[PDB]
Amino acid sequence: FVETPIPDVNTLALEDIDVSNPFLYRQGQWRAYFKRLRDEAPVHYQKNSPFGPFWSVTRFEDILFVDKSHDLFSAEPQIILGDPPEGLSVEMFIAMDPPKHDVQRSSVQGVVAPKNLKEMEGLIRSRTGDVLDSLPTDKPFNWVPAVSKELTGRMLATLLDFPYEERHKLVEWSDRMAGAASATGGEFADENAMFDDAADMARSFSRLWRDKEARRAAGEEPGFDLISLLQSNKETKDLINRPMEFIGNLTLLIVGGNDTTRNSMSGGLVAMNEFPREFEKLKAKPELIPNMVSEIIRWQTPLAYMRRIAKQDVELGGQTIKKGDRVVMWYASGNRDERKFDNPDQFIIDRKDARNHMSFGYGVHRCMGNRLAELQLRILWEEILKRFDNIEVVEEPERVQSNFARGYSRLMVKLTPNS
């Protein structure tokens, strides 16, 4: 993939609108392209793309139907638009249908048990406050590494009890995975690097499993982390011996929580910068933080879509999706659908229906980590409000190349503390 200027959507025949282009978000053309699809081709077939042909489903109501109807639309074998590079396919329950999906999700869902998240609030808030206190207030800095990636990486390490000093690896491996050119149009096109990483990652999870079992056998009390949970349950105490399940489950937790958390933490600042009256509203009414977090997640939509395959011919939106066709559920478009949300492109932190967004999906795959993400975002903004009278974005944000992740690689921020 090489970036070129994306033309006005009005220059295109409807059949030539290709929303798999991974520069549509960066260039700001995604809003007009998806509005044209919602209005005039809400169930749209693209015959020609670098990823092969695919349907786009772009209205909120129709996306709900596809996401909930796993008897008609399969999540197998992959949920990104393209294909993983050869040798890198791993089975993850995000790309599995019931009943097996339900079985595999049950084996890990305890890691985000509400009682466990509540016990970790002090740690999350301490990390958040320490990170914010460390930021300079006399010069701008890049928020993406300093805050969003920093906090996400610590959280991911805690979730796995992954060696804290190596947490940068959970994220580097994960980035090169979720950013495969063949899968998402991301910038990673070297299969040699992905082979090195996927193997390093698999070896690292195996060493962690053995270190944790040796520590448990030696009398270490079990913790909140996923490995401890897997080793405490009869069904999964032997998960090492099922390598596809073991590697797939652990990889899904890390990839699932990595750039989603990161880009939600960054995106709230970008939304405030575009709608600065909302920050004055927030400072005057801090009890809006929980609803604001929903509005940040709606407006940002950190994952633009999830993909499905039609299990049979399905009539949708005056169109016949054929058995075997790839069907892309464009959450990024659904969350801007004016049939669902009034003034959808506005960031409105007291929007009463913000919580009804589809950024987590709907149906059996609805995000397992939704409460953990919301918790971290709430604490982030609580701790921001204690410290800063103003936040300024000093340069146009740099947006990531991807058709899947909607995110930022550079967000240059100047802080003004209160007195």
Q: Which residues bind ligand HEM (CB under 6 A)?
A: 67, 93-94, 105, 159, 252-253, 256-257, 260-261, 264, 297, 302-303, 306, 359-363, 365-369, 372-373
Distance CA(79)–CA(62), nearest Å, equals 18
Distance CA(353)–CA(340), nearest Å, equals 9
The residues, ordered by sequence, that sit 6+ positions from 263 with a Cβ below 8 Å of its Cβ are 148, 300, 302, 405, 406, 407, 408
Residue 36 or 268 having the CB closest to ligand HEM: 268
Q: Looking at residue 136, what DSSP letter applies?
A: -
What is the smallest separation between the CB atom of 202 and ligand HEM, expressed in angstroms? 18
Residue 194 or 377 having the CB closest to ligand HEM: 377
What is the smallest separation between the CB atom of 290 and ligand HEM, expressed in angstroms? 14
Residue 81 or 367 having the CB closest to ligand HEM: 367
Residue 6 or 117 having the CB closest to ligand HEM: 117
What is the smallest separation between the CB atom of 118 and ligand HEM, expressed in angstroms? 15
310, 321 in Cβ contact below 8 A? yes
Residue 36 or 407 having the CB closest to ligand HEM: 407
Q: Which residues are annotated as a binding site for heme b?
A: 101, 105, 308, 331, 362, 365, 367
DSSP assignment of 90-124: ---GGG--TTHHHHHHHHHGGGG-HHHHHHTHHHH
Half-sphere exposure of 100 (CA within 13 A, CB side): 13
What is the smallest separation between the CB atom of 153 and ligand HEM, expressed in angstroms? 12
The residues, ordered by sequence, that sit 6+ positions from 261 with a Cβ below 8 Å of its Cβ are 148, 151, 152, 155, 373, 376
Distance CA(303)–CA(172), nearest Å, equals 18
Residue 85 or 256 having the CB closest to ligand HEM: 256
Structure tokens at 321: 């999706």
Q: At what angle do helices 289-300 and 277-284 cross, to 10 degrees?
A: 160
What is the smallest separation between the CB atom of 383 and ligand HEM, expressed in angstroms? 18
What is the smallest separation between the CB atom of 101 and ligand HEM, expressed in angstroms? 6
